[PDB]
Design an enzyme around this catalytic site. Structure first.
Site, mmCIF file in Angstrom:
data_model
loop_
_atom_site.group_PDB
_atom_site.id
_atom_site.type_symbol
_atom_site.label_atom_id
_atom_site.label_comp_id
_atom_site.label_asym_id
_atom_site.label_seq_id
_atom_site.Cartn_x
_atom_site.Cartn_y
_atom_site.Cartn_z
ATOM 1 N N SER C 95 0.833 -1.206 0.000
ATOM 2 C CA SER C 95 0.000 0.000 0.000
ATOM 3 C C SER C 95 0.874 1.266 0.000
ATOM 4 O O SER C 95 0.607 2.202 -0.742
ATOM 5 C CB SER C 95 -0.947 0.018 1.186
ATOM 6 O OG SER C 95 -1.829 1.141 1.100
ATOM 7 N N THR C 136 -10.248 11.229 -0.780
ATOM 8 C CA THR C 136 -11.384 10.790 0.027
ATOM 9 C C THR C 136 -11.755 11.778 1.130
ATOM 10 O O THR C 136 -10.881 12.270 1.844
ATOM 11 C CB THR C 136 -11.053 9.446 0.702
ATOM 12 O OG1 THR C 136 -10.670 8.498 -0.305
ATOM 13 C CG2 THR C 136 -12.251 8.912 1.483
ATOM 14 N N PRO C 138 -15.098 12.696 4.241
ATOM 15 C CA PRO C 138 -16.296 12.216 4.954
ATOM 16 C C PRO C 138 -17.666 12.351 4.253
ATOM 17 O O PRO C 138 -18.603 11.643 4.629
ATOM 18 C CB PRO C 138 -16.278 13.057 6.228
ATOM 19 C CG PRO C 138 -14.820 13.231 6.508
ATOM 20 C CD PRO C 138 -14.171 13.397 5.152
ATOM 21 N N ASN C 139 -17.792 13.224 3.252
ATOM 22 C CA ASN C 139 -19.104 13.497 2.622
ATOM 23 C C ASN C 139 -19.488 12.580 1.441
ATOM 24 O O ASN C 139 -20.461 12.857 0.728
ATOM 25 C CB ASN C 139 -19.249 14.992 2.244
ATOM 26 C CG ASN C 139 -17.961 15.598 1.713
ATOM 27 O OD1 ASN C 139 -17.232 16.269 2.449
ATOM 28 N ND2 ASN C 139 -17.666 15.354 0.441
ATOM 29 N N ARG C 243 -5.019 0.475 -8.926
ATOM 30 C CA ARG C 243 -5.859 -0.733 -8.979
ATOM 31 C C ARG C 243 -5.173 -1.859 -9.735
ATOM 32 O O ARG C 243 -5.297 -3.029 -9.364
ATOM 33 C CB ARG C 243 -7.216 -0.417 -9.593
ATOM 34 C CG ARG C 243 -8.121 0.349 -8.646
ATOM 35 C CD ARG C 243 -9.383 0.777 -9.304
ATOM 36 N NE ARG C 243 -10.188 1.642 -8.446
ATOM 37 C CZ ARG C 243 -11.031 2.566 -8.899
ATOM 38 N NH1 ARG C 243 -11.171 2.756 -10.200
ATOM 39 N NH2 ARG C 243 -11.722 3.318 -8.052
ATOM 40 N N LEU C 338 -6.094 -24.123 9.009
ATOM 41 C CA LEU C 338 -5.083 -24.089 10.075
ATOM 42 C C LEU C 338 -5.645 -24.539 11.410
ATOM 43 O O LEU C 338 -6.847 -24.451 11.643
ATOM 44 C CB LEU C 338 -4.495 -22.684 10.232
ATOM 45 C CG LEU C 338 -3.728 -22.103 9.050
ATOM 46 C CD1 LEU C 338 -3.015 -20.815 9.474
ATOM 47 C CD2 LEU C 338 -2.733 -23.070 8.464
ATOM 48 N N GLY C 339 -4.763 -25.010 12.283
ATOM 49 C CA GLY C 339 -5.118 -25.357 13.660
ATOM 50 C C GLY C 339 -4.235 -24.624 14.662
ATOM 51 O O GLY C 339 -2.998 -24.690 14.589
ATOM 52 N N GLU C 358 -12.050 0.811 -1.242
ATOM 53 C CA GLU C 358 -12.725 1.737 -2.154
ATOM 54 C C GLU C 358 -14.187 1.943 -1.755
ATOM 55 O O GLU C 358 -14.715 3.051 -1.858
ATOM 56 C CB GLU C 358 -12.652 1.215 -3.590
ATOM 57 N N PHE C 378 -25.834 2.151 -10.351
ATOM 58 C CA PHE C 378 -25.174 2.627 -9.121
ATOM 59 C C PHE C 378 -26.167 3.238 -8.128
ATOM 60 O O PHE C 378 -26.059 3.032 -6.917
ATOM 61 C CB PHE C 378 -24.081 3.650 -9.454
ATOM 62 C CG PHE C 378 -22.997 3.104 -10.337
ATOM 63 C CD1 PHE C 378 -23.067 3.252 -11.709
ATOM 64 C CD2 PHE C 378 -21.919 2.425 -9.801
ATOM 65 C CE1 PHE C 378 -22.078 2.737 -12.541
ATOM 66 C CE2 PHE C 378 -20.923 1.909 -10.630
ATOM 67 C CZ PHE C 378 -21.007 2.073 -11.999
#
Ligand SMILES: [Mg+2]
Ligand SMILES: [Mg+2]
Ligand SMILES: [Mg+2]
Ligand SMILES: [Mg+2]
Lengths: 388, 386, 379, 387
Positions: C95, C136, C138-139, C243, C338-339, C358, C378
């Protein structure tokens, strides 16, 4: 305690004596009289109309209709058990019964006049008269079929989409728009087979439900006398009451077809070998059998509880969406799992599974509804519609 | 005329007896009032308040099926289930603590112990004054290497148990070990007490899930056990299996409680969060997921209620527990994953805790779908384990 | 004619020699220097900014940026191979690189002035300056706004969940400018009115630091606006590049989960034989192998198309959706095999975030649905 | 400037050589022109026009990999795949007829036959003048047995579910032969003059109804010495043929899946619900995205496998990956498509129901059980889980 692999939660012990008796009567009839017919009926795409009088004689038609009108006066749990035993043989036979009981007898009983009830119900109950139901039209994707007021009654024009029973029906319950004081209202009308403007052409070439006769209803100035309009309902409540009843029977029926597929698959993997041992010795096969058993067992507790609630009056209509969606979806998944466990190609008795599978593919989408039922439940949880 | 209850479509509430509703409400009051305020910090810092056992014992939540004669509340299986569900609704770690005390410690002492053992241990376990643990699992049942040797006056035990819930705070240890008697090597159960020389229980830190519960090892180096501390009335697999069957029933109810919490959190979140100027709840893909959560929980609960009723009637075969444990754990984990994938932040995230908890619960016993194979053998008569 | 279980379609043979060495270099770096860091970095949520300089010195940052501006002048296939080797260790590290390469170097290179390119790109390429990308808010249309003032612009607003922001030196911020259009601005740490507080206590991607960008009348001189882009094309170009790297990266994390699961079931026993002797386990291994193998063919082909200029943006939706979805499915299948209670768990929580980063809705399905049908779904 | 091709997102078309595109176009023109008009009636009535073999042979679609020396078109594995995909796009029954002719009859004669056998049979099979079938599977190890007699062998036994058998000229039959102290599987070529050979048709199939299937019944069927395959013994013989056939099926199933996807897509654009196309629904768009994704990735897989087979770098396990993936994903797509259409068989869109039952059989011809998963599991772990 002893384990019953075929009934892990002992549904048999959650039923009353009268209910076990109804189940056993329906099983005896289905296995004795429908099972011998089904392979040929499905192959040739035909049905013996004699089945209605047979079922009527045993008291399997209009299970919830009171004895006053010729019905057996049973309850919703009994209706469900009957549907399950019939569909265990074939969904087409269950469809024919669904139409007679939930789509024709129910609306006449709920919304008809005393005269209509006394005339039609006893004949429908014995199977002497065969019924069908005309609702859905091509343009519904509200409705085009129209009743025009004329001297002495109504003149109906329009057409309804493939209706189960229509080419052999004596009695037709048709929903049409009627102008009432300037506004169109949906009303229900009872037509008889000899009506001049009525034709009920058969449809063949079906992939599923081949054991059931299906056709259209075509109305060209079909005269209906004033006394044959259903007086006590208008709007969507009429057809929706019928559909709700029918969907409950489908929820039980689908589990019967699933059970048949499971039993066939289990017996098959016991009988067939690979690498010197039964197919049932394979973990992958055992996992599939476990899943079939689990989903049927849980599904049955669901529909039983729903039936008990409907009989008590505590069941809201949304619960039918839960159970119809679950039964039809899981049954189809089970028929697919079973189909994929079989070898060969359609000659052996185990390929009754292929018949159940194509039937369930129609039933699941006969209205196009697994997704619509999800959105009914979504709206009920969220208060937000996502249909359109 | 009938009202739809989205959170309880089949009216489970109305299928319960008044006394069962009262047990559920008491467990709910305790879990929400005393465990909910603790859970976030307990999980984050991996700390367990041992006082919780005394709190649960006081209100009769430890060993629900154990008779009043021995300090238990004398409840039935449906009641045990309802309690597990209310505790796990808060956290699986807390339910695990209870499960161990009730099904893995009190049950075997009650079923297989002597009169003296029952009188000594059960009342203190019931109040939570003594905390119990269950030593079966070893580092990497019939495969076990922990061994008891007969000596004058008792037994000497040597071996190691791993991933033992409660062990670092336990007073009482139920340990299963092999004893070679008549050349035949069979499993026996032993009750050991904290302070036994040769017994240690170091904690395991840095768990991914079940962090609200403390877990450790049991290390036995020539631990002496007097003759009166062997469970006299059981040999072989029946011993541990009886305990596990009891615990699995509670987990089947519990997992549905955790699933309900994930569903309710996801539902509220998608009502609150918006995308493209509409709540997320307006999306068909989201509503389909909510429909599936509701359906699987509703049906799962009918299954475990019916199983509880059959257990109380004496009509339930052991295989039925496999159906329900497998279904509840599998469907709960699926629902936690669906809920997680509906959230869009990065730590509502009560869901993330339930998710990692359920990942451990689903994996706690086995990596392999053993319940499917139990059920496949029951249908076919053919064994597919090995 | 020998079968390679770990590379059934011989991806190694479909790569050119320089591409193979890029992969081997990224692998040597990731396994040598990131793998020993990751367990403690994730547990304690610590970041070491020197990682950027290590990556930059090798030439892993801005792989597609030309030599003239400090890049290694590679291509999209190379970028993908790098992302895959880094995410094989940890998504948090991938990232950090995704941001540096695709979200910061790309828009300056594609949309910046010559002055901006000459100043910023060589320092980003070496990792001596760390970048972040402020889109990005908050709105959920944006409200961050640039006002024209003497000498440039005054920026006010707030960006949230910004990878690298608390340690960044360079900030590419998208804001509305009243002529009303989205424009891109380059800010530096030390700009009066810019702050970047950190977000602590994350569930996934804990090895990467994330924060906010808060702008309170921050002055941006005229020479710091990106002159050659306006509107959605600006941020969308950046996201499309990122992406693509994620589509490769997710397959690396999936491969790690698969390899760990396989080794585990070979090592652990049940009833006196490996867990790997069970049919149910073998089916899971077969499914993991299949999905990774086909996933890699998809991203390879997309990479070759991007390098030829024949790839439409919708193809990225196919591969991003597939890689992230299948990788998460594989991580979950591996987790359930897995264990115990102790790297699969880390990959799994990371991939849960990467899948939802996203948004919660299946936007890529809807992009593809619209492209097939001509109908928008959408809203 | 790049345009998106929704029906070919990765531009498979640009990954092919010019000659490969010509082969694909020729197969498409034939399948759409000559098979599409037959298929509905052929499937409904369970009829097969044997003229199809001659039509396919004359344009060079039979035995694609067979060299020009023996009447074959001298193409490669990618071309074989492309042909299979174009035929199965119309119907799996037609692809099955071609698979048999190419991989199950021409391939064994080419790989294991004498020069005399190759010269006699291959040119006739290549034109479709002679129709072949392959007899391995028994009604239920192998029980069909060859006994040495003067001049050749006497075969007795039975093979079941044999595609083409009731219309075949050439029968490739696998039988046990006890000879010189060892009992081994051998391959035998039988022809129409054989008194002890019969091939009664099987009717009433669920799937693959457009392809005629029968039995092979052998009652002291004489096979001369010159008709035994000299260069193979044991399971290697039939397994080589099946491995070849599976490659073509992996391509073919993607063609059938593409047809289901295209039908579904067109249906949801045409059909309305609540006043808008079904295609307006998010739930429907998600399904379309999934179809597109799996077909696109599947095709890259089979193309790469074809390229590897042509280079000599493909191990047999890779065929298990692709066969398993193509058949599994194709069947999932056909079921998704079926569930989107609803209704009952009447409309042209219920070509989906035909593809669905075909794919259900194609997946079942493999076995009751995920055997390819277990082949792959063993290849990853070195541990056998078949028993
Ligand atoms: Mg019984
Ligand atoms: Mg008429
Ligand atoms: Mg309430
Ligand atoms: Mg001929």
């Amino acid at each position: 305690a002893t384990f019953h692999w075929d009934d892990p939660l002992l549904l048999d012990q959650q039923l009353a004596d009268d209910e076990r008796m109804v189940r056993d009567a329906a099983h005896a009839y289905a296995q004795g009289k429908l099972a011998p017919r089904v392979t040929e009926a499905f192959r040739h795409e035909t049905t013996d109309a004699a089945i209605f009088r047979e079922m009527g004689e045993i008291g399997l038609l209009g299970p919830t209709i009171p004895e006053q009108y010729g019905g057996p006066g049973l309850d919703y749990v009994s209706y469900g058990l009957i549907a399950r035993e019939v569909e265990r043989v074939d969904s087409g036979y269950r469809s024919m019964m669904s139409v007679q009981s939930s789509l024709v007898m129910v609306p006449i009983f709920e919304f008809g006049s005393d005269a209509q009830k006394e005339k039609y119900l006893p004949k429908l109950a014995t199977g002497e008269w065969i019924g069908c139901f005309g609702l859905t039209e091509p343009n519904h994707g509200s409705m085009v079929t129209r009743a025009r007021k004329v001297p002495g009654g109504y003149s109906l024009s329009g057409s309804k989409m493939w209706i189960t029973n229509s080419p052999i029906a004596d009695v037709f319950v048709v929903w049409a728009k009627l102008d009432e004081d300037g506004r169109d209202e949906i009303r229900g009308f009872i037509l008889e087979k000899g009506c001049k403007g009525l034709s009920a052409p058969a449809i063949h070439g079906k992939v599923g439900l081949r054991a059931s006769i299906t056709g259209e209803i075509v109305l060209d100035e079909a005269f209906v006398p004033e006394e044959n309009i259903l007086p006590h309902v208008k709007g969507l409540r009429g057809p929706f009451t019928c559909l709700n009843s029918a969907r409950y029977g489908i929820a039980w029926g689908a589990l019967g077809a699933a059970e048949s597929c499971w039993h066939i698959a289990r017996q098959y993997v016991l009988d067939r070998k690979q690498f010197g041992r039964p197919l049932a010795a394979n973990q992958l096969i055992q996992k599939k059998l476990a899943d079939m058993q689990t989903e049927i067992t849980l599904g049955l507790q669901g529909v039983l509880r729903l039936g008990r609630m409907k009989d008590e009056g505590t069941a809201a209509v949304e619960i039918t969406s839960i159970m119809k969606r679950n039964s039809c979806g899981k049954a189809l998944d089970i028929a697919r799992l079973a189909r994929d466990m079989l070898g060969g190609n359609g000659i052996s008795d185990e390929f009754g599974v292929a018949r159940h599978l194509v039937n369930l593919e129609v039933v699941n989408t006969y209205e196009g509804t697994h997704d619509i039922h999800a959105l009914i439940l979504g709206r009920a949880q969220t208060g937000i519609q996502a249909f359109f």
